[PDB]
Amino acid sequence: MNAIDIAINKLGSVSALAAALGVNQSAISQWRARGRVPAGRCIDIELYTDGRVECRELRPDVFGA
Known about the structure:
The protein is built from 4 helices and no strands. It is mainly alpha-helical. GO terms for molecular function: DNA binding.
């Protein structure tokens, strides 16, 4: 059980989830098996896992500036 997984359950699929997150179906599978998402995406997943499971993303590595 993780945020990425519960967001699959909530939206009903990984194709729906990945379309919403702006990634591919494979990226979701990596993130779920990784147990975390890249910087700036957990926000959306945490909408779908709001009171089910607390979500966490990585902090900015390269980012910019």
